[PDB]
Design a protein that fits this description.
Largest sheet of chain D: none
Shape of chain A: elongated
Number of strands of chain D: 0
Number of strands of chain A: 0
Order of helices and strands of chain A: HH
Chains: A mainly alpha (87), B mainly alpha (49), C alpha/beta (283), D mainly alpha (46), F mainly beta (103), H alpha+beta (360)
Largest interface: C-G, 91 and 69 residues
Number of helices of chain D: 1
Helix content of chain D: over 70%
Family (chain D): Belongs to the NOP14 family.
Subcellular location (chain G): Cytoplasm; Nucleus, Nucleolus
Radius of gyration of chain D: 20 Å
Number of helices of chain A: 2
Family (chain G): Belongs to the TRAFAC class translation factor GTPase superfamily. Bms1-like GTPase family. BMS1 subfamily.
Organism (chain G): Saccharomyces cerevisiae (strain ATCC 204508 / S288c) (Baker's yeast)
Oligomer: part of a larger assembly
Shape of chain D: rod-shaped
Structural class of chain A: mainly alpha
Bound molecules: guanosine-5'-triphosphate, magnesium ion
Radius of gyration of chain A: 31 Å
Order of helices and strands of chain D: H
Distance between the termini of chain A: 105 Å
Largest sheet of chain A: none
Strand content of chain A: under 5%
Helix content of chain A: 40-55%
Protein name (chain G): Ribosome biogenesis protein BMS1
Strand content of chain D: under 5%
Chain lengths: 87, 49, 283, 46, 14, 103, 368, 360
RNA sequence: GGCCCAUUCGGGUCUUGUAAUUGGAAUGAGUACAAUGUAAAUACCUUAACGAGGAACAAUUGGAGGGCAAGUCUGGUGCCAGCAGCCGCGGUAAUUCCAGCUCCAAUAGCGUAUAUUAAAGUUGUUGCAGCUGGGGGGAGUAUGGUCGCAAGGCUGAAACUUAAAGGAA
């Protein structure tokens, strides 16, 4: 019957995820994964996120070099710079 | 404990050193580290003096 | 007495919600008799319908709608006591619950499970009915267990619900004095509107048939998903009359309506006064 | 690149959250402690 | 970041 | 406080401070309630973050005064009332599981 | 006349207007400017267009209800069929097509046949986000990705929930059990009810395994519905030092390659002593070994930790109970609990040997 | 499975009402008998806007482009931006977002980027002063169209920040059984990248037509100077008539183009407004669609709104046919009981709508 | 080793403890023979039999204070400060864990909210805008709240890189 083949495909996914539940974990759900408890370099293909200490060193681009460039254009145009003065 | 359950302020137990890494005895935790660090700091302070 | 007047006038205030129950021809209030297997129920439904409609309704089945007032009529149905599924469904749609308690044995987990399922799905009115008051010679322990059941029932329903005490069964059903003032308790209950029920069009089915074609069954051979008519009163919000309205029949699956023909009322209430024994009907 | 982007978006999120929580704290302080002190002021007359 | 929590998508078969 | 009564019934609008990142902070256990008598919106506490998930919305709350016995530390002075019931059930009994909240 | 013309839908709309006497264009149709100029040179056509709280809410809603009645008092097949339709107390026959065979075959009239009308939301599937709670009288704790039968609206259905926590409102990260005595969040693939609706949940619905305990296991309300959830499961990467200096160390095995360390450069690590640190550069010849810098000198008996987060998925599993399509109508069996599967196929429960706690005794700490 | 429509008419209303109702639709024969048959780029980018706003909705355009399959999903909102094409202004895309706007998880904070105005579409002032007050009294309270910069056609370059931040459950039931008394009549005359005298010429033309009615006329004036002016010369005028005791409004706008006299455009928009007042009753001919859409997605009650005879048209009843085609509801036009005019009062019983996306 | 005092340093004192083992006695709630009582029955009264070790035959209510994790969050002048913590790697037939953390008070009773009563410092004057109308001390300080006012930047000069003239240096 209609409910019969509904029931057997239900029982199919019943069986496949009940032995997913009994069967062995993925490594990636388990915590404390060492080096020897992983696929070797599964981590390049991982797309894993985390946090870092400090903002890394800025890569100097054309737009930031023209930013401080027309900054000092404005500055040395109006001569509002800062030096020492003689005593 | 005004609005706290005694099944809520339970006792979390602390973990031991891994048995593979057992020759370096006693995985030390934060109380052991502060006992280490303030000893080092008082001895460096008197050395600087 | 002014502070008393303020603190009493305060507890009249409640959350103002809509009603969505009509005042002209309201549906028959669904009374669900809920008990563990082996107490009351049948004998109790039989006794109540015999007092209400003067008709010995031996061998009950299904929902039973009778007229019990000048404008209050009500539907009697009984949960199968082993099924948590039917327990859950009638918890979700019942309006009054006659909660059968074996007072000799005490409280039980089937009635406790119904009380919690109802409490989470929108607690209806609950009148507790304690039977098997044949404890021993000890009227002392009768009174003791009486008080203990009343207090434990009062911690599960509001403090001041009605626990009713039925004596021993006499000639097949309960004493008619006790069933008379039990129906007096059912007749004044003052129902308050729930939420899921009053934003959802539901219906308990008292009549069922398949209007399929038997020679089509002879052609294809009993595997056929066959069409079905379902007759009954509907409660809650107005169910729309266009075909294609989606409907969950709670226990067989999800369907959509095909055609609705509303029928004249099989158990109608008639238009100080009293209720005529001519007009005490039964469907 | 992901380092710089993640750090600066986390800083932005924290600086937004602190402003939001401080805002709701002192709006609950001001426009309800005025009513608390008004009730205390008109209860001291009794 | 635009893809990260989407679930739909237009299916342009043109 | 409420006028002439000792308690007042109210309607839960929305759990204020639901995004506070500190458990059991006074900002977090802090509910906004519309009193039903005069219609005005006040703010009330709740005993803890643990009993904060017994109120959700339009819950028919009942609220009394607070009564601070001393200047607290993590306080927000300027919230006067505390929630003492919810849907006609005492939420201290709910918090210690003596009753179940009916709906 | 005009309503019958509008809803008589085999005639063109201009034919409705013609026998009574397009929306990409937003601004409506006007005349020519010259016709409108000669029409509105005059002005006098439109010169007359120119020139307690609880009882209050109840009065507003009863005012709406009397408006409902006095505007329902209209045409009889308009009211009683099509403008509202079948209010309450109407006795109806209702025909369903394609009802299963097993209902009509095994129809036992003891079990009630209830029907309820689904809203536009409740025909949608997807992730329902609830907050739930182990019921205080249910004995055993609940486990994520163990099925339980929910009673969510009209439907009863067995699903695989996964219990989460928003740990101080930062993540929504994944627990492995429900808490003992309070609420957690949860997320299950099921039919999307509206928010703020309550539900129960049951481990076992049959009677052969009904036991002696309390059978309702979970209670809760629904917080939110969505088509997707983004929940995470913490994974830490552990590595050990093998060459320690002041303030820096060489860390052995949390990575398998210098490409992996290059992927993870600059990340903050810490020892189990809470000494914070940062990984700096992959060493060249031993492959997964790198150089980290710490707050101060770590020891040879430490473990460093890189706390990362792995995303986890809810399992799109849904079977409604369909108890009335059985020959017994109790004894419904769905997916089993994980302890029941282990007891069936006799697998021992997974025991990490160095996950078990011990009785640590401190040695006295003396320094030189 | 799919409710089937034909032709590329009412396309935005069909996709909008399918998103509200949650019903999968197909639109078949999108201009199939044509030289370049199929969907155009502005309605394809409208589909992209729908995918931006919702989540889990699958749209499925065919090979030939002449039929589309919309299986809707949950409205989630969020902050976005939309770089709509030059074929339609930002009003063509912010008009169908005002229906979906108060019914999402997160509040609408979108900024559209493109041409500001068009002859045959909604403007910034149109959207704001006409279409925001009818939502403002249908239940929303915080809605705002901001102009950060505006761009006249053909090059445009103007950005518009639509922000709605009241996420209501459902719109309230309307009860407008009156014709609202017009208290004032105001407006806004705008001009970008042209001389500031054109605005005063437009204002003087509109007010010399308006001067013979005995109400009060006030037209505000904005020239746009700088980067806020956009990439093209343009100018236009939008008048509203304002009922202040209830909040109702009746608007009319247009824009000038290459060879247009500003006094001519001012008097044209003034006479077009007075004709909208004539053919209007409690709504406008263009405020009427979302008015009756919010009345049909209100509560499960009766909501009644007065309309006049001349507001009935092929557009209005094809709207009503599409409403009944999607979620099976009828309007009941009962006439008023006084006979100096022909006004119906449309009563709609709203479906039982709630927004189920907003977290509780 | 316990206890007591004290702001401090410290002082005063003394058979005191322990989920340590263990022993036989006691009976009461309950379960119940009866007889008495009474029209009859209930109850009171009298009363054989059984009835305790977690005496599990399982009294509460409120308060004070800790302590813990390869845990989480916030701040910032390393290792800290704070908020806190049912959420930890695994694990639920799994675990045996600060032995179920310690202490305190009432005890068949015990909290909370609101209103209150009593106590005397009961003045010797003048407290505002004057022909009556009144909030609550003096001196200050802070402000992620609400309402305002306020910055830019040579003017002309923007749709125009535009004149004369002026300013500034
Ligand atoms: N002594 C005594 N017996 C009762 C009482 N009420 C019901 N019964 C007995 O209960 C027996 C079982 O039948 P029902 O009471 O009809 O059973 P039910 O309560 O309907 O429960 P199900 O068997 O699950 O249907 C009957 O034969 C009655 O004699 C009562 O108050 N006292
Ligand atoms: Mg029976």
């Amino acid at each position: 019957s209609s409910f019969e083949k509904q029931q057997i495909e239900i029982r199919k996914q019943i069986e496949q995820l009940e032995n997913e539940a009994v069967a062995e974990k993925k490594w990636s759900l388990k915590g404390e994964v060492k080096a020897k408890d992983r696929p070797e370099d599964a981590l390049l293909t991982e797309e894993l996120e985390f946090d870092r200490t400090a903002k890394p060193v800025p890569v100097i681009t054309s737009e930031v070099t023209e930013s401080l460039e027309d900054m000092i254009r404005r500055r040395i145009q109006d001569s509002n710079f800062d030096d020492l003065q003689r005593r | 404990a005004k609005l706290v359950h005694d099944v809520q302020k339970k006792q979390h137990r602390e973990r031991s050193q891994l048995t593979s890494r057992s020759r370096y005895g006693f995985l030390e935790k934060h109380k052991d580290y502060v006992k280490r660090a303030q000893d080092f700091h008082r001895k460096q302070s008197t050395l600087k003096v | 007495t002014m502070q008393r007047s303020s603190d009493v006038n305060e507890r009249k205030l409640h959350v103002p919600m809509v009603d969505r129950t009509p005042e002209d021809d309201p549906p028959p209030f669904i009374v669900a008799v809920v008990g563990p297997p082996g107490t009351g129920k049948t004998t109790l439904i039989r006794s109540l319908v015999r007092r209400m409609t003067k008709s010995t309704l031996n061998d009950i089945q299904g929902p039973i709608t009778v007229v019990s007032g000048k404008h209050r009529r009500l539907t009697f149905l009984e949960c199968p006591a082993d099924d948590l599924n039917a327990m859950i469904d009638i918890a979700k749609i019942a309006d009054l619950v006659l909660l059968l308690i074996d007072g000799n044995f005490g409280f039980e987990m089937e009635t406790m499970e119904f009380l919690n399922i109802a409490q989470h799905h929108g607690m209806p009115r609950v009148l507790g009915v304690a039977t098997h008051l044949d404890l021993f010679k000890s009227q002392s322990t009768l009174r003791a267990s009486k008080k203990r059941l009343k207090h434990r029932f009062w911690t599960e329903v509001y403090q001041g619900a009605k626990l009713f005490y039925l004596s021993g069964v006499i000639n097949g059903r309960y004493p008619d004095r006790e069933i008379l003032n039990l129906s007096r308790f059912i007749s004044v209950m003052k129902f308050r509107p729930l939420k899921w029920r009053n934003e959802h069009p539901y219906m308990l089915a008292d009549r069922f048939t398949d209007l399929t074609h038997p020679e089509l069954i002879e052609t294809q051979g009993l595997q056929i998903d066959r069409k079905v008519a379902i007759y009954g009163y509907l409660h809650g919000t107005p169910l729309p009359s266009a075909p294609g309205t989606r409907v969950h029949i709670a226990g067989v699956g999800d369907f959509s309506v095909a055609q609705i023909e509303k029928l004249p009322d099989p158990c109608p209430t008639p238009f100080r006064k009293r209720l005529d024994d001519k007009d005490k009907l039964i469907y | 690149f992901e380092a710089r982007q993640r750090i600066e978006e986390k800083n932005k999120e924290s600086s937004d959250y602190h402003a939001k929580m401080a805002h709701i704290v002192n709006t609950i302080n001001t426009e309800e402690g005025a009513e608390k002190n008004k009730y205390e002021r008109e209860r001291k007359l009794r | 970041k635009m893809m990260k929590n989407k679930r739909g998508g237009v299916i342009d078969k043109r | 406080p409420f006028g002439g009564s000792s308690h007042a019934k109210g309607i839960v609008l929305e759990k204020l401070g639901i995004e506070s990142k500190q458990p059991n902070s006074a900002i977090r256990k802090c509910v906004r309630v519309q009193l039903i008598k005069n219609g005005k919106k006040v703010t009330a506490f709740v005993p803890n973050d643990g009993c904060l998930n017994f109120v959700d919305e339009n819950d028919e709350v009942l609220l009394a005064g607070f009564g601070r016995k001393g200047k607290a530390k993590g306080d927000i002075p300027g919230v006067r009332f505390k929630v003492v019931k919810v849907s006609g059930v005492s939420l201290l009994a709910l918090w210690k599981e003596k009753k179940e909240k009916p709906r | 006349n005009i309503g019958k013309l509008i809803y008589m839908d085999n005639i063109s709309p201009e034919e409705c207007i013609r026998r009574w006497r397009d929306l990409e264009k937003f601004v409506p149709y006007f005349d020519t400017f010259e016709k409108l100029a000669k029409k509105w040179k005059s002005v006098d056509a439109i010169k007359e267009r120119f020139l307690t709280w609880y009882e209050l809410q109840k009065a507003k809603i009863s005012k709406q209800l009397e408006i409902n009645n006095i505007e329902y008092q209209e045409m009889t097949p308009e009211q009683r069929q099509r403008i509202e339709g079948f209010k309450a107390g109407s006795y109806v026959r209702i025909v369903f097509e394609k009802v299963p065979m097993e209902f009509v075959k095994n129809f036992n009239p003891k079990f009630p046949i209830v029907m309820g009308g689904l809203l536009p939301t409740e025909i949608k599937f997807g992730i329902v986000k609830a907050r739930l709670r182990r019921h205080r009288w249910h004995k055993k704790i609940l486990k994520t990705n163990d099925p339980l039968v929910l009673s969510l609206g009209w439907r009863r259905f067995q699903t695989l929930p996964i219990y989460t926590t928003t740990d101080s409102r930062t993540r929504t990260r994944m627990l492995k059990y429900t808490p003992e005595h309070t609420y957690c969040n949860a997320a299950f693939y099921g039919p999307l009810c509206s928010p703020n609706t309550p539900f129960c949940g049951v481990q076992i619905v049959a009677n052969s395994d009904t036991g002696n305990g309390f059978r309702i296991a979970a209670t809760g309300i629904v917080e939110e519905i969505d088509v997707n959830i983004e929940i995470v499961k913490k994974l830490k990467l552990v590595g050990f030092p093998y060459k320690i200096f002041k303030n820096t160390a060489f860390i052995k095995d949390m990575f398998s390659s210098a490409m992996e360390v290059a992927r993870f450069e600059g990340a903050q690590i810490k020892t189990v002593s809470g000494i914070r640190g940062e990984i700096k550069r992959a060493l060249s010849k031993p492959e997964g070994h790198y150089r980290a810098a710490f707050e101060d000198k770590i020891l040879m008996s430490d473990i460093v930790i890189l706390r990362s987060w792995y995303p986890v998925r809810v399992k799109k599993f849904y079977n409604p109970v369909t108890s009335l399509l059985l020959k017994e109508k109790t004894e419904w069996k769905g997916l089993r609990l994980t302890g029941q599967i282990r007891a069936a196929m006799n697998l021992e429960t997974p025991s990490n040997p160095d996950s078990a706690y011990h009785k640590i005794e401190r040695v006295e700490r003396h320094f030189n | 499975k799919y409710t089937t429509f034909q032709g590329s008419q009412n396309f935005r209303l069909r996709i909008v009402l399918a998103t509200l109702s949650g019903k999968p639709i197909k639109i078949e024969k999108i201009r199939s008998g044509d030289l370049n048959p199929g969907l155009k780029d502005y309605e394809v980018s409208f589909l992209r806007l729908i995918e931006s706003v919702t989540n889990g909705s699958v749209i499925e355009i065919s090979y030939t482009g002449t039929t589309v399959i919309y299986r809707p999903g949950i409205i989630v909102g969020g902050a976005s931006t939309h770089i709509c094409p030059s074929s339609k202004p930002v009003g063509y895309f912010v008009e169908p977002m005002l229906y979906l706007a108060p019914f999402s998880k997160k509040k609408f904070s979108i900024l559209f980027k493109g041409i500001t105005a068009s002859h045959n579409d909604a403007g910034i002032e149109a959207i704001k002063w006409g279409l925001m007050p009818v939502m403002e009294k249908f239940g929303v309270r915080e809605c705002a169209l901001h102009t950060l910069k505006r761009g006249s056609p053909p090059l445009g370059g103007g950005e518009v920040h639509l922000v709605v931040d009241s996420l209501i459950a459902q719109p309230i039931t309307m009860h407008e059984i009156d014709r609202p008394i017009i208290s004032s009549i105001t407006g806004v005359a705008y001009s970008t990248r042209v001389s500031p005298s054109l605005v005063n010429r437009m204002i003087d033309g509109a007010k010399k037509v308006l001067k013979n009615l005995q109400c009060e006329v006030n037209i505000t004036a904005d020239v746009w100077r700088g980067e806020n002016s956009g990439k093209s010369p343009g100018w236009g005028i939008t008048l509203v008539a304002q009922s202040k005791q209830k909040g109702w409004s009746y608007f009319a706008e247009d824009i000038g183009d290459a060879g247009s006299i500003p006094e001519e455009l001012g008097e044209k928009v003034a006479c077009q407004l007075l004709e909208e007042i004539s053919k209007s009753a409690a709504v406008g001919r263009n405020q009427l669609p979302l008015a009756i859409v919010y009345m049909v997605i209100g509560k499960e009650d009766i909501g009644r709104l007065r309309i006049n005879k001349e507001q009935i048209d092929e557009r209005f009843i094809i709207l009503l046919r599409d409403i009944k085609k999607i979620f099976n509801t009828e309007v009941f036009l009962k006439p008023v009981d006084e006979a100096d005019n022909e006004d119906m009062i449309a009563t709609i019983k709203g479906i039982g709508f709630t927004n189920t996306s907003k977290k509780i």
